[PDB]
Amino acid sequence: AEIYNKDGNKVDLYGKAVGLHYFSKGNGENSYGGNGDMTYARLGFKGETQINSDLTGYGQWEYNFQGNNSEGADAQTGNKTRLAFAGLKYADVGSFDYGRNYGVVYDALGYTDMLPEFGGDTAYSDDFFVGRVGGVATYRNSNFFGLVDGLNFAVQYLGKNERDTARRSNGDGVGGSISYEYEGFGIVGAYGAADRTNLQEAQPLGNGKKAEQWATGLKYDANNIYLAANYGETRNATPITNKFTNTSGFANKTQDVLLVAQYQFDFGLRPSIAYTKSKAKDVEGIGDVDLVNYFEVGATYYFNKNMSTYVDYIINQIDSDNKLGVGSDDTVAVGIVYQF
Amino acid sequence: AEIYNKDGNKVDLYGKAVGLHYFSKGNGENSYGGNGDMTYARLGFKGETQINSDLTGYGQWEYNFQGNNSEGADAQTGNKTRLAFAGLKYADVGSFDYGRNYGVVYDALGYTDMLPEFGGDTAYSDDFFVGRVGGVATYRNSNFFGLVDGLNFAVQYLGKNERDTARRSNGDGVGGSISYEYEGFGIVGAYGAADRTNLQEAQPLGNGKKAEQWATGLKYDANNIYLAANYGETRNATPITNKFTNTSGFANKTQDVLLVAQYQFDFGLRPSIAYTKSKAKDVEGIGDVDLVNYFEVGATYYFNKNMSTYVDYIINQIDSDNKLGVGSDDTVAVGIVYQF
Amino acid sequence: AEIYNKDGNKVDLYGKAVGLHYFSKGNGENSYGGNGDMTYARLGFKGETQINSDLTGYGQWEYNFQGNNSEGADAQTGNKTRLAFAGLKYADVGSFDYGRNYGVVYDALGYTDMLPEFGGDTAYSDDFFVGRVGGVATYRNSNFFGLVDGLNFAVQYLGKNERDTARRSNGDGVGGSISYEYEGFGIVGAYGAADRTNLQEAQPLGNGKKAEQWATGLKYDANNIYLAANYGETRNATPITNKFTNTSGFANKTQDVLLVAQYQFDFGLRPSIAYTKSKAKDVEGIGDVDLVNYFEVGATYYFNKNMSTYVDYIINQIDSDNKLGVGSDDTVAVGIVYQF
């Protein structure tokens, strides 16, 4: 919601209140998404001020507030800051911002991150270039300096983040994307690579000093039709765990495929169909393991632009014999979302 | 405050900044409410969008921010999300929302929850149907489908919540209320019951597999006069602790009485008078124990609609010989509240 | 940003999104400010309602949200409530508010707290009267009841706060300030003293039962020129640590000097020059130790009123032979700030 627009500085304060609930067999510890209340909310703001007629300053902050906690000690479990950055966009040169923001490889993975609830599996947060990250300096350029419509590129610089965890840690690195949008087609390629840190190298699963991720997208988005596909691979970057040996680390290699098919009816119904398959390769002592695999059937029914509800169903293809001990049961999400 | 109302979607962003302080003898660990700085703030938003002329989507999120903490490690102590849900209200059929919201038995207890600071004693949060709860689906209906003015009812479905604590946990259950408002009178009856979970059954105090709460209210609210009374009982649901045996659990039974008497002067002064008495029965090895007992004398002086101050005094009737070790000293709250 | 002004109640909801990063040699554990991503954000609101033509109610809440955390367990590390209070300002009598607010001795230290990033060294939070504190009742009076322009005074009452930590704890005390502003000159004197608590007295470093702080300021602020100086001293109040003995407590005495020199160019550039020196005296087994010492060179370039960037450089004068083990390396901050 645009709560303010005076003296060329508009502030968009927005939020969400998602009544949500998962359904999985038993206590669902063996299910794709889990079982239980999953209600949460959001709050944030994106500001934009015009320094002049070419230069624009902008800032954004988004925060997730969990609603499925009690007002006891667990109150904060899950609350986190999702985005926080600032920048200046200028004429045709391009934009530059810095802070907690999405990694460039997300640009590609973005194409398939359209499911009602689930999906987006390979875009782990705090995992180098595929999801939200801390301290990334990003430079994007539009229409190749205005010369070519639809030709976009960006180069990101990931700063080293040595945290308490190997999972949330990352060394420094660089990445970049290139996308061309035309008619209702989009084609993307993005890649990045950064140093793994000592703690990361110290983990039992995964071996290397350089983690690199890359993926490409293709999409036909026009005339109530959304079709998109993603494919990517990674070296020592997808976090994994062996539930049996109680070991953790990263998959040495992974072949990722994401597919989406969605149609937007006029009356508000927007069914969804998708396929997700992530397979780790060269996992020590195991070899090839499916980290994710399933089919999705879903439907979001938008009332107006500030209301909707959706049902998401995950036909979990993962089998019980999974080596890493991944869950094999299905999950069903049922949400009702109010926003502004 | 209504910061936005465009295209039939009004957003009410509100808050509080309560400068507060308690006064009790000594360090007050033996006092009703404690002693010290109790300053806090609130922030939230309730949105409402008109899907059409019968259907309305709405959402709400409220968060408590504690101000009596240092900026050190204790910073977050007390911060919690108080409410978070979403729903659709429709024509005369009624409303339906889901998320973190008040339990139906609160509908009754609401009548007496009007004190300047204290009061509301029996409406514990995260305690089945008497206070705020997680994952409750609620259906309310107004004026009996519009047929009878003042006749209201609601049926709530409490979802199972297996948390780290027995106190904050709850099995699944159902509850409902019925209220009739007329002239300036109100009469309410509400009841609910749900399964106690293993962890709860596992506690030393309290025995049963089903916890059920119920209460009724009566109130005369009109012409600057507010008079209300509540009475209820519970089976294995009111959380209790024996400070001496260092044991916890739930009271097998409790007889609750709440009484309020308040008058609204024209110039802003609104004195308060109240009586609260909660007694546990069948407490193992003890029998009958008063969990709460006192008289209250208070007064809120509202300047305008965004300012007030109040003094609340609790004449603590609990004696020193209390078996469960409940505090016996008095407490005085003195707040100054700004809001919007 | 003033998101609302109706019926004489204006609400100013504001925020920040600071993309920030420190630069120090090595991992910088021996540097002044540290090394790494330091991105954060702010959110808050100050409200003001006119009770009538003399009386005004007002409230404020400010919260710091850290952006340099991962979305993992460390998510909340650093989030804190910075301010939270409420009051009534009246005619010429003066204002009175209560809650989490700045201590009076800050009034003096304020003069030198103008650096782009660093600076303000001696105004520790949760440290009696020099920084933000919990439960302080403050009374300020303007222009000596309107009789003398520029003559201002305030008397603060610090409530006892017995927290988990000696550092964040404080006994009760009183403080007050006196400031006279004229032409573009300002002269301030402020002082306070309060009881140290048992836990504080219990610490190895620092001996006394009464902690007292005081400081004075002088400033020439007019015609794009800002020049300010501060000098103060303290008894058993500045928190200190001996990195080698792994001991903590408070400096028995400290001589603090702060100096600032800044000029505001018309086009937006605002260079900064400053000197900071805090020296502890009578530190057990050591004697005199510099807690802080350096020169600063900085520059903030404001685009418009909602955008800026700055570079701050700390020429760290602290030597390696520091007895308390204080860091000796330099630090460089580079921020880009969007606000509203």
Swiss-Prot record, chains A, B, C:
The keyword Signal is assigned to this record: yes
Residue spans crossing the bilayer: 1-6, 8-23, 39-51, 54-66, 83-91, 94-100, 135-141, 150-159, 172-182, 184-195, 211-222, 224-235, 253-265, 268-281, 292-303, 306-315, 331-340
CDD domains xrefs: gram_neg_porins (cd00342)
Stated induction or repression of this protein's expression: By growth in low osmolarity conditions (low sugar or salt); activated at low osmolarity by OmpR, repressed at high osmolarity by OmpR (at protein level). Levels of OmpF protein decrease in a lon/ycgE double disruption (at protein level).
SS bond partners: none
GO cellular component: cell outer membrane; membrane; monoatomic ion channel complex; pore complex
Keyword Ion transport annotated: yes
Disruption outcome: Leads to decreased susceptibility to a number of hydrophilic antibiotics including ampicillin, cefoxitin and tetracycline. Deletion of ompF confers resistance to colicin E5.
Effect of Q262L: In strain: B/r; AA sequence
A family per Pfam: Porin_1
InterPro entries: Gram-neg_bact_OMP, Gram_neg_porin_domain, Porin_dom_sf, Porin_gammaproteobac, Porin_Gram-ve, Porin_Gram-ve_CS
Swiss-Prot/TrEMBL keywords: Cell outer membrane, Ion transport, Membrane, Porin, Protein transport, Signal, Transmembrane, Transmembrane beta strand, Transport
PROSITE patterns with a match to the protein in the record: GRAM_NEG_PORIN
Main function: Forms pores that allow passive diffusion of small molecules across the outer membrane. (Microbial infection) It is also a receptor for the bacteriophage T2. Is the major receptor for colicin E5.
Family: Belongs to the Gram-negative porin family.
Protein's name according to its UniProt entry: Outer membrane porin F
